[PDB]
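Exercise (ungraded).
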Amino acid sequence: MAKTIKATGDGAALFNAVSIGLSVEILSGRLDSQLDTPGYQALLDEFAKHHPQFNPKSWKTLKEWLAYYNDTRDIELILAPVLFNLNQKYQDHLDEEILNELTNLVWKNKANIENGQAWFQLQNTGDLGEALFPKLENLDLKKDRAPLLDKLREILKDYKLELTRENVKQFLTEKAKELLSALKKKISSDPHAFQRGYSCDELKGMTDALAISLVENREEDITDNRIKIRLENQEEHWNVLCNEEDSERFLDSTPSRLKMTSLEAYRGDKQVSAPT
Amino acid sequence: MQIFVKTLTGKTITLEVEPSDTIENVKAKIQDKEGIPPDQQRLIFAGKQLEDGRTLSDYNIQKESTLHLVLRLRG
Amino acid sequence: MQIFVKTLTGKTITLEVEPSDTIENVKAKIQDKEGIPPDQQRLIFAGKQLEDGRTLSDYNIQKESTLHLVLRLRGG
């Protein structure tokens, strides 16, 4: 009895899906009680910083934008990058995140790296199906990935320790200080970060601050009394659920108005014009 | 037109393509930014495996459709 | 104290924890030994899902309690 709204699979389907669902909650008014919270004013700030024609800077105007651009794809194009930028503001431990990606890469592919194996031939998943180093996979192959394997083959020439993850970790903290900072530069400035692939919890700081709970494949904590965005994931893709009573009132009201790629959206070069 | 190729990790790349493009030609675009020989790529779209001789329009693959990429060796 | 983390493949992780540790710390300890990033970890004790900011002693998790590790999916 709940409609599954298809989100676009550009690698940012988590953001696209959350955008659509968060819109319905905003236009329905069920979030009006939380619009003067720090988290939502932070969102209002990030929405204004992305849309130069967005004025006046208020939840009144932001509601009007979502009602003008009520097509789900237009909604993705104007809101997903805003939730993306807002999400970057809650990444407190990112230096450590990279250290754990690089140690997963080395621990699980030491022999592969020393034998000069191509990036696609690597082990990038774990025994439970998890993704070992998704931020590094996203960098450019020719400029970033292939050189990484080249310099890791060099550094590992001094790896005379046993092949534990603990040793790899301590080894990288001592022997790869500059390389880790170089990867922080490239990852933080990665123009295609939004295609990286995403987990719900990667957004937990922002959703928490937005008084929103993310329900993945109907695995709902009954204790949680928050507004719930219900997400669906089947083929490594994020869609969103929405009630028919809401989808007919706050979704696909209008035809598609925007003709821009997802890349053009996230980089903000192509401006979205003010409504009417 | 743009189309997306998604991996089993959720990672997605963007491809610039015309509907007149052969699947054979699509894998060559995927080799260019991932290093994967075409005979090692398996492309699935809505459960239908994509064979090299056909075009994107034969598979009703339109703008911003998402394909799935698998490695025949890994599976 | 010691707790057991059983995945559904059959592997059993044995962590050295304290009642005052958070669920966040447990997920990091799992990362230290198995490499699983916490953002893909869902920990379940006796049917209830564990919140990152609450302690083990909150959920009354005690010595040799067994926790379940479920993977959180990614999407593109």
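Further reading is listed at the end of the chapter. For now, observe: The radius of gyration of chain A is 21 Å. Chain A has twelve helices and five strands.
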